[PDB]
């Protein structure tokens, strides 16, 4: 015995094509903003070692919540010719 | 110690042995877990039971690993070195014959350790062994490998902190002088709690049990259930209970009630199980939770209930995956639907099938009933009630026990032809053990 | 008198030397270079001191050198040698700069000469990216430099600016959120390079912070971004270049708990296994010993790995850095799944392995085989032997 | 009618005979696929 | 049993055109049950045609972008997008063919060539540049004689 | 066809059948040669161009 | 005729050819090229001293060939799997097309077992597959995984053996289906068994030995007499090509 | 099939509309070039070439040379992968 693939062939495989039809960037874009980003503005944290618990704990599920994955990403601003 | 070297030496031999050899390879794996089970008996022939209670001491200068020999122990490794050429029997590679030879030289090691860090050291050093040994690429389940690696790792991994805290607190690892220095017993409490609370099946940290010692094969399912389990129990025993015991005294009501839980809720998924090895599996749950409330009762002779307890269930229960392997191994399939009329079909197969049936239930002439009246007597001195729970779901045990029986043993006949010598001589060790240890068990 | 300053006019000297005997050497169309090598080795063990960091390096180096081939290559190990060996005497920002940027520029065209194939292109483009990101960071460095030289008039490293550096030599070991040069470096240049890469710079670097580096401030939140950014990157990339270069983001993140908890016995333990694995691990033809390597890197029990990740956990339970040990200890759990399936992939597959035709036959094995015996190790480490 | 023994014992494998050898698989279960399933 | 046929290789013998980046058609004998990278790389077609199979536990299997008619879209094999097969496929269209992508766009190791393959015209596809270690990568540009079939291995390392 | 295939086959194999100890010991060393000369970072490939079948310099390039 | 001279072989045109019948001693190599044609194999094969592999050869992982065996790669290209064994004076070779239109290289799988004197040539043969002594297997013919050939089997071109059954005779018809256990066991301990005895030669052989020391004595005595003469090969092939060269310019116009 | 059946064949017939030799009404979607249109070789040619301009390809001299009726020219379109 061996499970069923749920769904259909062309409704999968057009799911599996979606939002790749374009030329990927270069990911030195990416690496000189986080570093644009981290020289320039780390050392707003170092006031936050000190805080409480608490607030860092909670601060810290706020960033794992608020996150967006970079793999897989896809905007639909990709494909409009207007605003 | 010379002796266990030697030991180790010649069954490391196995793999210089040319593979063409093949009469000379079975003889050699097979000898080299012969050996241990005299020397341990030999141990056993020269315990003083009126003299201290650690004998036999080796320690390591300042590598921790240092042993001693205990009742708990003796007993455990005893067990262990019967179990452990019938092992080899099942076996047909030299693969299996090496994890099975270190995982021996692993399991005797931590059993009989007196060191904390020695014991995290040899115990989870078995866990690559256990992953290659449950999800092998044809007939194994990689799901269940990587579920019982994971629950291990994650136990460990919670206990090594508060190793190394009490470890910084007073100086050594060492339990004898771990269990004279002041120490805060909270924190190492949880961590010791959170590795053996995995390794004895205790809800909710249980579900890698039912995957793993199915998938497992014959041999792995033997040494996972009268073995592995037992190193939680002999954990606490030797561990957490002289370490820390204020914290082992205040967490009695939460330890209590996963027993409770755990005892009922297995018990009653039991019923519903339509796999024979997942039927057997599950019913190592129970047995387990019995045996940690008797532990953590501390109230009449509560080591001596609870080791007797855990030999009880580690002669009973390899010898009805025994039995479930045979089945599977002459007959392809481990589902009830197949099987029926074995009785007629099976005449031994089936009567040695109602003798563990009738042992995995705590029947007299067996030593699960000796067993389980002392632990009820154990459990049974703190309050009644805590006793009354487990006295009266006996007829959940039972049910599933008869049923399973019943419909397998029963009915129309159909399924394979009888046992063979090697199967009968896999088998017999663990009945005359059972004769003996139910019937005249001390002098 | 110029009496204690020998061994300079003798690296000089031999440089010297060296240069116009590969020089002779190829007019005569040697295509190999074996006898240059070794002199480049005898230089490597004259010009190093006589401290256990230094010889480390100069072992190291050694080694290391018997994965090159050409003579400019091996030159620009040398002068890269050069910059690791006195980045570790420097007791100022100016030759941190310059030992720095000598590092940085061997490394760049070290990537650009060495590769071959269908792999050419790249291998630059990864060695141009880094290249760029390297230049803001030196000018960071220097910015930073000049506000503190302005500030307290001297040489001395103290004060706010100290933090700026402490973020450009987290940028030399990869430390994540600065860590995806490292990870383009790791995809497409070609292994040699890659292990010259993960063990030499981090060690010369972790010494130059071990002698001469304090700052009034943490790194915690560097450790938190490594430690799950690596453990959760190795998880989820199937190529295993990308894999390798994430465990070493999570790796270099247990070695900023050793270094921010102080204690660096830890660190220096915890370094040298690891790169003893990183050079068993480039050099591999065998591919049964890559499970060895997978369960020295997870931190299992009897191997070297769990001794030097386990000292850094008992260093960190005994100061009570509770928030960042429980971190470090749900990102190695997580780090044995994908070990385990380097494990799945390696050991539980039929064995081959081709031999050599045009001699040098399986060129490593003395090295590798050598490396293996990582399992004798630790009988050595369980003493007080790294303090 | 298979021959799985020589007269003084001697077991032989039967790779190429006619007959079907009796052996480990002869009496596997026959798959009903709703039990399967 | 009876007097009935003898198998014969032409019984399961499987024909595909195959029309390459040139737009020379090709004849492609397979057989049943074999892949179609797997016909296509004893074909003797060319190296940079193929690229791994970027899923995990599946690197050494070669794979190539081809166009598949709408009679024959629904005989290639049904991928769950949720799976971490579905997430392999992705990958690949994620990353090795970008912008070349059609609605006619699949990967020959998800089509396995059976009866009603036969007679089926395919065509290969575009990809962009692409590397998996410095032994294995692609610089973009289709000039090389060397087939993919005369490798004596496939290494994910 | 058959017949001619085999006078082509059997030219080729006696071709390298009946070399001698120092000519096979000769193209070893030469197989050698230009296994080392493969690597394009070679830095000999800067001054010296290389005869393809024996791996001597053949030419100054520069 | 065709001429046994090559001025575009790899390694260029050979300087001294010596006829068969002046050989003192036997020269037969057991792993060599033919032009630009090598042999690919694993470092832990076992070559027998009187078995021949030359040409266009892939070898895999735990595979041997036995006394006397032939792997002829001359026309095309043939691949032994892993742990496959070829058994005493079996020849395996290729042609340079099959009727079928597939591929001509012979390619066999692996755990493969080939049984003495039998012949492959352009052939299928999948994984797990017991080929009979004295059996013959023509031009593109498959034989499909966990199969059987009984002896003296002959499978005519272009003709395919099911998977999962025995088949023997002349021509091949069906004679039973392989158990369940045959097909998960047998095979592999079949093939296992043959590696077993190739690692059991692999221990004992010492490589290159010293019969060398007998033929080095003759040479010896040779530098001793002045009779020895010593050829710059690579001048000598430099020479060759350039007045190969010379004498094509000096025809054309 | 890699493209549709009709779409193909009303642009072929706008195609063929404004050819000068042509009869406007006479285009049938199956016709021959040689008995019922009536062209010679250049013409063949030339409307070969309005259909590459118009469906973006490249037809080789023998592919264009097996194309001999309106339905040849609209099934290899049709069979060719790189259509527009
Ligand atoms: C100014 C100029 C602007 C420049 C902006 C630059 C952006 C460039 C883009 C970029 O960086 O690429 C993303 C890039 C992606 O990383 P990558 O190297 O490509 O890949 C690495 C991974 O593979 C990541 O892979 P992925 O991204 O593809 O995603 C895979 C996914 C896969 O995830 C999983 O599968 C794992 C998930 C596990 C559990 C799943 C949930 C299941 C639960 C069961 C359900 C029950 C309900 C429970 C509900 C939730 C409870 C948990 O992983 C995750 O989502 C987890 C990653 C999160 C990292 C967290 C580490 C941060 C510190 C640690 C503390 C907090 C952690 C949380 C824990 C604490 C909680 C108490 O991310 C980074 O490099 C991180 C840095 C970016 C963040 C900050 C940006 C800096 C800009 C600063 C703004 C201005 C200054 C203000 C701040 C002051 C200075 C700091
Ligand atoms: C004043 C300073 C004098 C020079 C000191 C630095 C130069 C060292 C270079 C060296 O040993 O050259 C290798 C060279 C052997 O290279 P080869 O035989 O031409 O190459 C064959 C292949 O490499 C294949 O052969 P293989 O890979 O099996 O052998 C490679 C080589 C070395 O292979 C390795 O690199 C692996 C050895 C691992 C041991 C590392 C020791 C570090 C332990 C730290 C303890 C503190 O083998 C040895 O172990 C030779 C050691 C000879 C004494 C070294 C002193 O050794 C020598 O000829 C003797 C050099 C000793 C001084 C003259
Ligand atoms: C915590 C106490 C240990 C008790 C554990 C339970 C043991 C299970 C079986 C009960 C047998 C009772 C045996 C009593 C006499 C034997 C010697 C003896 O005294 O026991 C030893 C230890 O006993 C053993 O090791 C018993 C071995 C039992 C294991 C049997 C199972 C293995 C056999 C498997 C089947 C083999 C069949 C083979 C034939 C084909 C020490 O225990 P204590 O008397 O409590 O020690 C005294 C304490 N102090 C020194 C501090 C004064
Ligand atoms: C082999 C050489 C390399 C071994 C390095 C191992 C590093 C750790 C890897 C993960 C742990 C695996 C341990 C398993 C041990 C038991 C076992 O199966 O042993 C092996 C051999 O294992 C050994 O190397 C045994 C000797 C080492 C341990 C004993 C001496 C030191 C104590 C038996 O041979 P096969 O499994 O048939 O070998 C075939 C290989 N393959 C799986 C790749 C198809
Ligand atoms: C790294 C190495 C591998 C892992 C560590 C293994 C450590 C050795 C095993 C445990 C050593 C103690 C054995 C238990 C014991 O009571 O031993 C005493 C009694 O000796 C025995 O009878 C030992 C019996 C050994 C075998 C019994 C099982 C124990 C562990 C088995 C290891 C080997 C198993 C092989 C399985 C194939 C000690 O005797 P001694 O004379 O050295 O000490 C007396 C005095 O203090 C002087 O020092
Ligand atoms: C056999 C190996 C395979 C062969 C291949 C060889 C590989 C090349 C050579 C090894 C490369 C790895 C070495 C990494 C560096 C580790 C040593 C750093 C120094 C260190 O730990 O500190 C010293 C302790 O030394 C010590 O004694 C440290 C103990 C050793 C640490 C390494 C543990 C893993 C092995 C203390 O320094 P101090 O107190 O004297 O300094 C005060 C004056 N500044
Ligand atoms: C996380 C790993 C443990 C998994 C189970 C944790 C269960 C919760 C702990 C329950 C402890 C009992 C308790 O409440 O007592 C606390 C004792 O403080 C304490 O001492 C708190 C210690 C509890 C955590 C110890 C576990 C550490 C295990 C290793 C962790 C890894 C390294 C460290 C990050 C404070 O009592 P209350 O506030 O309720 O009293 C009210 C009146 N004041
Ligand atoms: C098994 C592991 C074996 C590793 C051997 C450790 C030996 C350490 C010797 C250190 C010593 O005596 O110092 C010499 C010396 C310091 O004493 P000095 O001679 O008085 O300067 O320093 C060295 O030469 C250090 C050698 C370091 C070798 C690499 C690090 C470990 C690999
Ligand atoms: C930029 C502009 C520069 C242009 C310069 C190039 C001009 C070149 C023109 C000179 C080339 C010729 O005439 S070439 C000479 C062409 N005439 C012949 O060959 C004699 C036989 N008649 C034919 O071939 C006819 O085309 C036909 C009867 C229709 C055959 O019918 P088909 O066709 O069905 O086949």
């Known amino acids: 015995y061996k499970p069923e693939v749920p769904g259909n062939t062309v409704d999968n495989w057009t799911e599996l094509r979606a939002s790749w039809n374009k030329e990927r960037a270069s990911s ?46 896809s905007t639909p601003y990709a494909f409009k010719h207007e605003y | 110690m010379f002796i266990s070297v030697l030991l180790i030496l010649f069954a490391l031999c196995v793999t210089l042995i040319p593979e063409a050899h093949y009469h000379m390879v079975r003889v050699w794996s097979f000898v080299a877990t012969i050996i241990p089970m005299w020397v341990v008996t030999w141990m056993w022939w020269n315990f003083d039971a009126s003299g201290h209670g650690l004998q036999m001491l080796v320690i390591l200068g300042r590598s921790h690993l240092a042993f001693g020999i205990d009742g708990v122990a003796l007993s455990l490794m005893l067990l262990t070195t019967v179990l452990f050429p019938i092992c080899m029997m099942l076996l047909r590679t030299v693969a299996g014959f090496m994890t099975f030879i270190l995982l021996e030289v692993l ?173 057997v599996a599950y019913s190592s749950i129970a047995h387990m939770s019995m045996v940690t409330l008797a532990i953590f009762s501390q109230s009449e002779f509560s080591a001596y209930s609870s080791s007797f307890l855990m030999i009880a269930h580690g002669l009973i229960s390899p010898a009805l995956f025994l039995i479930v392997g045979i089945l599977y191994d002459r007959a392809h399939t481990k589902f009830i639907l197949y099987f029926s009329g074995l009785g007629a079909s099976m005449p031994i197969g089936s009567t040695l099938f109602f003798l563990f049936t009738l042992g995995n239930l705590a029947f007299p002439l067996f030593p699960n009933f000796i067993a389980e009246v002392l632990c009820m007597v154990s459990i049974f001195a703190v309050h009644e009630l805590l006793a009354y729970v487990f006295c009266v779901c006996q007829v959940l045990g039972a049910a599933y026990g008869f049923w399973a029986f019943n419909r397998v043993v029963h009915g129309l006949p159909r399924g394979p032809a009888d046992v063979t010598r090697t199967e009968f001589h896999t088998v017999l060790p663990l009945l005359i053990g059972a004769v003996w240890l139910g019937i005249k068990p001390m002098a | 008198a110029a009496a204690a300053a020998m061994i300079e006019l003798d690296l000089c000297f031999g440089l010297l030397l060296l240069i116009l005997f590969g020089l002779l050497s190829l007019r005569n169309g040697h295509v190999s270079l074996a006898h240059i090598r070794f002199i480049c080795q005898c230089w490597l063990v004259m010009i190093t001191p006589l ?141 040699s390079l890659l292990l010259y890469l993960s063990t030499a710079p981090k060690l010369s670097l972790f010494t130059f912070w071990a002698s001469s580096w304090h700052h009034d401030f943490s790194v915690g939140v560097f450790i938190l971004f490594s430690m799950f950014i690596g453990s959760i990157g190795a998880y989820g990339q199937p190529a295993l270049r990308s894999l390798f270069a994430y465990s070493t983001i999570n790796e270099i993140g247990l070695l900023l708990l050793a270094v921010e908890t102080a204690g660096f016995h830890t660190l220096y333990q915890h370094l040298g296994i690891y790169i003893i694995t990183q050079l068993l691990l480039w050099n591999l033809t065998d591919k049964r010993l890559f499970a060895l390597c997978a369960v020295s890197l997870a931190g299992l029990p009897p191997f070297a790995g769990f001794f030097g990740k386990a000292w850094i956990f008992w260093h960190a339970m005994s100061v009570q850095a509770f928030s960042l040990l429980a971190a470090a200890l749900f990102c190695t759990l997580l780090s044995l799944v994908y070990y385990l399936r380097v494990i799945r992939l390696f050991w539980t597959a039929p064995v081959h392995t081709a031999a050599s035709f045009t001699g040098a036959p399986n060129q490593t094995t003395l090295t590798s085989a050598c490396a293996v015996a990582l399992a004798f190790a630790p009988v050595m480490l369980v003493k007080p032997f790294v303090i | 009618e298979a021959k799985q023994f020589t007269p003084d014992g001697k077991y032989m494998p039967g790779i190429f005979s006619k007959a079907k050898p009796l052996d480990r698989s002869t009496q596997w279960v026959h798959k009903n696929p709703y039990i399967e399933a | 049993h009876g007097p009935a046929q003898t198998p014969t290789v032409f019984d399961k013998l499987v024909e595909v055109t ?108 575009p990809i962009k540049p692409w590397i998996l270690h410095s032994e294995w990568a692609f610089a973009g540009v289709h000039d090389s004689r060397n087939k993919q079939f005369d490798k004596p291995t496939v290494e994910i390392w | 066809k058959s017949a001619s295939c085999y006078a082509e086959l059997s030219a080729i194999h006696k071709f390298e059948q009946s070399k001698t100890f120092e000519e096979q010991y000769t193209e070893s060393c030469i197989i050698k040669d230009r296994a080392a000369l493969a690597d394009p970072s070679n830095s000999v490939h800067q001054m010296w161009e290389y005869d393809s079948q024996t791996a001597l310099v053949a030419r100054a390039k520069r | 005729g065709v001429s046994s001279q090559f001025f575009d072989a790899p390694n260029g045109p050979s300087v001294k050819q010596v006829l068969i019948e002046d050989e003192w001693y036997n020269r037969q190599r057991s792993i060599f090229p033919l032009l630009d044609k090598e042999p690919y194999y694993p470092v832990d094969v076992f070559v027998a001293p009187n ?24 026309l095309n290209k043939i691949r032994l ?26 390619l066999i799988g692996e755990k493969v077992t080939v049984e003495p004197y039998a012949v492959l040539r352009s052939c299928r043969v999948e994984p797990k597959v017991i080929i009979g002594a004295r059996s013959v297997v023509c031009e593109g013919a498959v034989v499909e995984s966990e199969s059987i050939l009984a002896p003296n089997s002959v499978v005519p071109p272009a003709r395919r053996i099911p998977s999962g059954e025995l088949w023997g005779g002349s021509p091949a018809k069906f004679i039973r289906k392989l158990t369940d256990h045959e097909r998960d066991r047998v095979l592999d301990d079949v093939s296992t068994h043959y590696h077993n005895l190739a690692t059991m030669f692999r221990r004992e052989a010492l490589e290159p030995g010293t019969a060398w020391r007998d033929v080095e004595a003759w040479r010896q005595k040779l530098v001793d007499q002045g009779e020895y003469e010593w050829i710059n090969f690579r001048e000598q092939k430099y020479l060759m090509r350039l007045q190969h060269e010379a004498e094509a310019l000096e025809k054309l116009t | 099939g890699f493209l549709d059946k009709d779409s193909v064949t009303e642009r072929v017939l706008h195609v063929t509309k404004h050819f000068e030799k042509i009869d406007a009404s006479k285009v049938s979607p199956a016709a021959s070039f040689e008995k019922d249109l009536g062209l010679d070789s250049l013409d063949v040619v030339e409307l070969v070439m309005a259909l590459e301009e118009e469906f973006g390809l490249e037809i080789p001299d023998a592919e264009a040379d097996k194309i001999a009726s309106v339905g040849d020219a609209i099934n290899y379109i049709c069979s060719n992968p790189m259509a527009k």
Request: glycine share 8%; charged share 10%.
């Open chain 2, 107 to 279: 399991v005797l090691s931590a059993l009989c350790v007196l060191d904390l860090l020695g014991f995290y050291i040899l115990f989870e050093a078995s866990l690559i062994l256990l992953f290659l040994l449950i999800g092998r690429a044809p007939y194994g389940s990689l799901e269940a490998a990587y579920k019982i690696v994971l629950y291990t790792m994650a136990g460990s991994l919670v206990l090594l902190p508060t190793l190394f805290m009490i470890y910084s607190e007073c100086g050594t690892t060492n339990v004898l002088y771990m269990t004279c220095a002041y120490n805060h017993q909270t924190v190492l409490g949880w961590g010791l709690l959170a590795v053996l609370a995995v390794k004895i099946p205790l809800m909710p940290v249980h579900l890698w049990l039912p995957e793993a010692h199915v998938a497992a094969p014959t041999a792995g399912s033997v040494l996972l259930a009268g073995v592995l389990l037992k190193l939680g129990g002999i954990g606490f025993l030797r561990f957490m209970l002289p370490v820390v015991p204020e914290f082992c005294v205040s967490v009695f009501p939460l330890v209590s009630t996963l027993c409770l839980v755990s005892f009922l809720f297995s018990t009653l998924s039991t019923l519903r199980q339509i796999d024979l090895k997942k039927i």
């Open chain 7, 81 to 106: 799997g892993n742990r496959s064994a070829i058994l005493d004076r079996a020849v395996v070779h290729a042609a340079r097309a099959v009727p079928t239109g597939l591929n001509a290289a012979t």
């Open chain 5, 18 to 125: 195959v029309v390459d980046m040139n737009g020379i058609r090709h004849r492609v004998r397979g057989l049943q049950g074999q892949s179609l990278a797997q016909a296509l790389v004893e074909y003797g077609f060319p190296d940079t045609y193929f690229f791994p199979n970027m899923g995990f536990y599946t690197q050494h299997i070669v794979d190539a972008h081809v166009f598949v008619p709408k009679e024959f879209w629904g005989k290639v094999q049904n991928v769950d997008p949720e799976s971490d097969d579905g997430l392999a496929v992705k990958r690949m269209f994620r990353d090795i063919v970008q912008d070349y992508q059609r609605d006619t766009s699949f990967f020959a190791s998800y089509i396995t060539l059976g009866a009603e393959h036969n007679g089926m015209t395919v065509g290969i596809g």
């Open chain 1, 28 to 73: 030195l874009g990416t690496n000189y903003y986080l570093n644009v980003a981290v020289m320039g503005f780390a050392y707003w944290l170092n006031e936050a070692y000190y805080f409480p618990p608490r607030t860092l704990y909670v601060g810290a599920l706020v960033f794992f919540a608020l996150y967006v994955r970079k793999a897989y990403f």
């Open chain 3, 51 to 191: 401290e256990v960091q230094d010889f480390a390096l100069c072992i190291l180096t050694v080694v290391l050198l018997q994965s090159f081939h050409s003579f400019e290559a091996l030159l620009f190990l040398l002068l890269a040698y050069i910059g690791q060996l006195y980045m570790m005497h420097s007791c100022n920002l100016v030759s941190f700069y310059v030992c720095l940027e000598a590092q940085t520029l061997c490394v760049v065209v070290l990537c650009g000469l060495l590769a071959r194939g269908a792999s050419t292109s790249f291998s630059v483009e990864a060695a141009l990216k880094f290249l760029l990101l390297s230049a803001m960071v030196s000018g960071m460095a220097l910015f930073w430099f000049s506000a503190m030289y302005q500030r307290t008039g001297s040489l001395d490293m103290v004060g706010q600016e100290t933090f700026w550096i402490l973020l450009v030599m987290l940028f030399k070991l990869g430390v994540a959120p600065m860590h995806m040069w490292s990870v383009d470096l790791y995809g497409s240049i070609p292994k």
């Open chain 7, 51 to 74: 078995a021949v592999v030359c040409g266009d050869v892939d070898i895999y992982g735990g595979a041997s060939v036995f006394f006397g065996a032939v792997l002829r790669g001359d």
